[PDB]
Design a binder for these strands. Structure first.
Lengths: 158, 158
DNA sequence: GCCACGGGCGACCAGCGGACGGTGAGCAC
DNA sequence: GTGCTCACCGTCCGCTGGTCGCCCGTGGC
């Protein structure tokens, strides 16, 4: 059965009602990294191809270990949000406070996350891929297509 | 349109007849690296996903860019041979001279290359992936499945 | 109860990495 | 000329990474 929908929460704020907050959301990425660690270890033992990123097998191993609440499309929906939380925790917290105060839904918050990321990519000579690779938490996540496209167009405009 | 078959040659020895030598074979790996670099530079300009290894797109680009003699299954047959040449030239050269002196065909030489590579993987805590990733030339090539499987069975035996 | 809203995640797709053996080139005699 | 050896690479396959929107949970009234 389908998980509760997310809601915009401030750091350390519990979601009220039949909803999950944004700290629960970011923790799902941290749990995935632990399931990637396990898969890598098993593959090293088996003498099979070892993944460097979160693959379909990592999701499949998470589902069979009871963590059925973890799935590929949902993790993909918010990778950029998690990237901002990792790369600039202070902007990520302020953005969450701003969106909560406005009584904004998750979708508007999720779309707003791309914009401070464009700034971070600008400061790193427009290399969004390198920004993910230098970070231990982000290293395992694929750069979302929409973020790379938005970064490229913004570079042309500015 | 089929290319000449390869023959076992010693370093710097030209192949005789309607045949190609082993230095020509190793040069094809070098050409692929240049084609990947092109594909990489183009992607960076377009703001598209950048490959870190030789993908189907690299091979496809080589064909349309005047190097039609390059194709994926051929390059895949000898990745392990190219790996011995990069990781240990001296052993690669002696193996080539030995197989040439015995009047051996390419198939027998090709299968012999796996064994010195197994010793090299053993000397690196059985981590064949690390061996490839630490070398500039090899980094762009996928570890062949047959090699990783052979290292695994050898680890269980020795 | 009821409806409108909005997002979770099932399921689909293009193309990937990977494999194999039938043609047909090649050389010895 | 003839035969017979053997490997190049056409062509296939289990999946991958990436995507979209249907279904239905959810909260307000």
């Amino acid at each position: 059965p389908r998980e509760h929908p997310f809601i915009v929460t401030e750091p350390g704020e519990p979601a009220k009602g039949k909803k999950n907050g944004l700290d629960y959301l970011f923790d799902l990425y941290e749990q995935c990294g632990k399931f990637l660690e396990e898969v890598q270890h098993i593959a090293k033992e088996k003498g099979e191809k070892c993944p460097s990123k979160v693959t379909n097998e990592v999701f499949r191993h998470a589902k069979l270990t009871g963590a059925g609440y973890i799935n590929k499309p949902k993790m993909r929906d918010y990778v950029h949000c998690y990237a901002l939380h990792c790369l600039d925790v202070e902007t990520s917290n302020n953005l969450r406070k701003e969106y909560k105060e406005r009584g904004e839904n998750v979708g508007a918050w999720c779309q707003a996350c791309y914009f401070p990321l464009v700034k971070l990519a600008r400061q790193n000579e427009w290399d969004i891929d390198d920004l993910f690779n230098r970070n231990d938490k982000l290293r395992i996540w694929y750069v979302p297509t929409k973020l790379r496209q938005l970064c490229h167009i913004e570079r042309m405009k500015h």
